[PDB]
Symmetry: D2
Subunit: 244 residues, 4 copies
């Protein structure tokens, strides 16, 4: 408790799934949270139950103007902005033959460009504050490949890289940038996926809060010397070789 | 030797720099090469000296129709297509604040989407042949970050990941996909960069042919059991830790 | 908070430096800690101030019998053992020609075998508890090489690998195994090294507690879905490319 | 053919398996080869059929004196020494509970120390020549973990690291050092292992010559700008995530 005292965070894609879990987890640690999404109905709903510590904003991460508005909301409503959780993302699949180029561009827009746009938008207030933490949500698909998962793999790897380039540039201003790489997490994005799809050492899929616990760590000043790094929370999948 | 005799290859961005070096290197090893670029003047120039061993075609890697035309050219002129070298690429830079969104979009289109389009275009002729080798040109900027080099870092990391997802999917068809990661290479793309910018064990920048030698290895059947892997040719930069 | 209340931990090399910082940090979070070392003077000294929260034991990590005695101490004094911090280690250097074989053998014994012996010693009490967290201290020298630092590099890379093999094997028993990779940390091991030797995004060396914060996270149940993974705390060094 | 003209190489563990394959492959490319092992019967046998281009020497890689003798044999019998293939290795397994410490030390001695001793022994003549290539045989077990494979995993990771530290130190002298990481290869070491143990994109185990082709590339001057790097030849295993 209180591990995020005085902190203000902005979470993209926070109306449901892991994003919603991150909002709740940070609020529980004392942070004020602005969360944006395109699911306004659900967004306003949870904002009502977290009203005193969180605010919902309509945010399509593919639009820079909306990102600016989200950041201004945090600054004007809560006083500042110290944490950014680039969580918004989509999942589409397809083999090289069936995958539509429109699907490829769409996932690049949301999963990659959306993350970059978020970073661009939060740096001004963070630099003025002299401190900040940017947490980009990648995945283990950003560490290795998967059949018929080209756009998703490409963007998750890209996010992994962008985390490092921005980390190097922003470090001198007191802003850390790290990426989180989870394995299968029980959320609506993978509800159709069997929980044991991956070979894991722990033998189970993850609960969203297990990823939120990592977000809290990275958002807090406890992780003050970690930047440009990959934090894996996958139950051990990438730690082992793929066996038959 | 004639390490590539019987092989037909398609090289993007082959009008100059490493691309041109790769075309010459493979032709020297007995390959028939179709190479495309947007620099038609220079492209047609070298096509003339390479005689009946190589054909030049205008190819903007961001356009799927042009990729298809280049592949059709290779199949009709040489009877098939067994090797693809996704070499075309651009370099732009800028801090998070100053970097233009148009530049970000353009580099994603050329460096990332262009590579994916190349893969899509060659799958058919390669699967028909039951064999194939796709070589994607990433870089050490696809292994670590660089200040004010976000679009480039993101795309090179993306290419690294796409190499893996496609390798897994195409393996069953006898097609290998690998990525090459060079350090500073002496070409027009980085002629404005001091040659000793990187801390190398070899204490020098790379010569294009030194990368072409790796392209030949991966294009040949000698590398038959290597796929989805990263081949680093950087003089030792990423093998060491960055010192101040 | 009391993020480790109820947990019992064993820390090797806990008489000074990071080890001592880890013991203090975990005790502050409610853990009961048994810490061992070969520096008995300093070890007993801090055990006295930590009072009933910590016990000091002489522990040469190269000796299996001493590891067993330390574990028995933890179980008898605190009722069990849930966390192991394999922190003991030494640093020696030398060029390929000048580096003494005795030094190579000694560092393998302490930095590598010592870590394995620790893992062996705690498996029983942890499996009995059905839970556990093993934290192995590697370093960025376990991610990249360093001139005239062969024994150290080899062992730190080995620890990184051992972390994975054991994580996979122990996962089914509810035991997590992860590795920590710090950059330059201000301790007596590297006091002879200039603090700005590495190119860091944060432009400074690490403080021991900054690593201890990561140890606490991994020791706590908050990191329940992370195992077999590398946690980097280097201020951004490995996230960037080495410049000359 | 002739890709190793004028080159003299030393191969440890070359009496059978991959080592024997490497000897044959390099001899076929014009290299003179001294190969050492502890299987003298078999060693002298193949030396008789390759007599004009290869010489067998008794070499226990755990003994520095024997390494010196092997190097002197290459220098005095063939005129110099330009390539070293640290191939000698053993495989033992066991869970944390059953694995004997004698087995652990033995594999550290052969797989790790043996490799270091080889590097120490070849540097003198290589530095005098001003050029050389050291090829260390690691494995994908040096990139990820495996249950009940602790000593093997630890040593293969260690070899991976030692490759980088030595590469950085030796680069200025014109000596490159790289590591090879193969997947399952059909040799007597894994004859008891099912060929489809790993999930591979190519759907088959490797033939030793497929690894030897990589040794030839790295031994040749074609790979002149690659050093401190990992070359994976595993049919795509590590390129993908472990799925059930
Ligand atoms: N579910 C998993 O197993 C898993 C594993 C690794 C990584 N991830 C990543 O975690 C993130 C969240 O995943 P999730 O499991 O909660 O999925 P989810 O579908 O539940 O939530 C994603 C959220 O992003 C919002 N969103 C989508 N497009 C948006 C846009 N253009 N602008 C703003 N908001 C947008 C969605 O409405 C939704 O609320 C994603 O980046 C995903 O790739 C998920
Ligand atoms: N120069 C280096 O140091 C270095 C280091 C690592 C990686 N690389 C990569 O190697 C590749 C080639 O680099 P280079 O050094 O020869 O650069 P270069 O500028 O000399 O050549 C790149 C070529 O691509 C062509 N090209 C650009 N956009 C194109 C498009 N849309 N369609 C078709 N062709 C297009 C250019 O006209 C040019 O001929 C790039 O992918 C680059 O990122 C270069
Ligand atoms: N100092 C750094 O910058 C740095 C960076 C990365 C990793 N590390 C690692 O962190 C660990 C602790 O480092 P430190 O900075 O506190 O060094 P340190 O010298 O201050 O402490 C190491 C401790 O281990 C003890 N020790 C040594 N050999 C032992 C043995 N055989 N049995 C039991 N105890 C033994 C020492 O007496 C000492 O108390 C080591 O594994 C080291 O490699 C240190
Ligand atoms: N077989 C595989 O699938 C596979 C996969 C990855 C890596 N590797 C590695 O490749 C290398 C060769 O493997 P292999 O498949 O040919 O095994 P192998 O058993 O056929 O050959 C290993 C050789 O090393 C020799 N040797 C063993 N201990 C020695 C010592 N102390 N001194 C000198 N020589 C010694 C053996 O007598 C034998 O000729 C090893 O390092 C192994 O770990 C093998």
């Amino acid at each position: 408790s209180g591990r995020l005292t005085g902190k203000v965070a902005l979470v993209s894609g926070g109306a449901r799934g892991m994003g919603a879990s991150h909002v709740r987890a940070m609020v529980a640690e004392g942070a004020k949270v602005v969360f944006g999404d395109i699911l306004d109905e659900e967004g306003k709903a949870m904002a009502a139950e977290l009203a005193d510590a969180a605010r919902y904003v309509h945010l399509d991460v593919t639009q820079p103007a909306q990102w600016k508005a989200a950041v201004d909301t945090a600054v004007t409503a809560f006083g500042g902005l110290h944490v950014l959780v680039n969580n918004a993302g989509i999942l589409n699949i397809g083999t090289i033959e069936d995958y539509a180029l429109t699907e490829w561009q769409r996932i690049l827009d949301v999963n990659l460009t959306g993350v970059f746009l978020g970073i661009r938008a939060v740096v001004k207030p963070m630099k003025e504050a002299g401190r900040g933490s940017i947490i980009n949500i990648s995945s283990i698909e950003g560490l290795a490949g998967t059949v018929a998962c080209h756009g998703y793999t490409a963007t998750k790897f890209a996010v992994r890289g962008l985390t490092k380039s921005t980390a190097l540039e922003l470090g001198p201003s007191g802003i850390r940038v790290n990426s989180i790489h989870p394995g299968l997490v029980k959320t609506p994005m993978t509800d159709w996926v069997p929980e044991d799809i991956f070979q894991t050492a722990l033998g189970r899929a993850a609960e969203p809060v297990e990823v939120s616990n990592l977000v809290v760590y990275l958002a807090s000043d406890e992780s003050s010397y970690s930047t440009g790094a990959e934090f894996v929370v996958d139950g051990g999948t990438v730690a082992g070789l793929a066996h038959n």
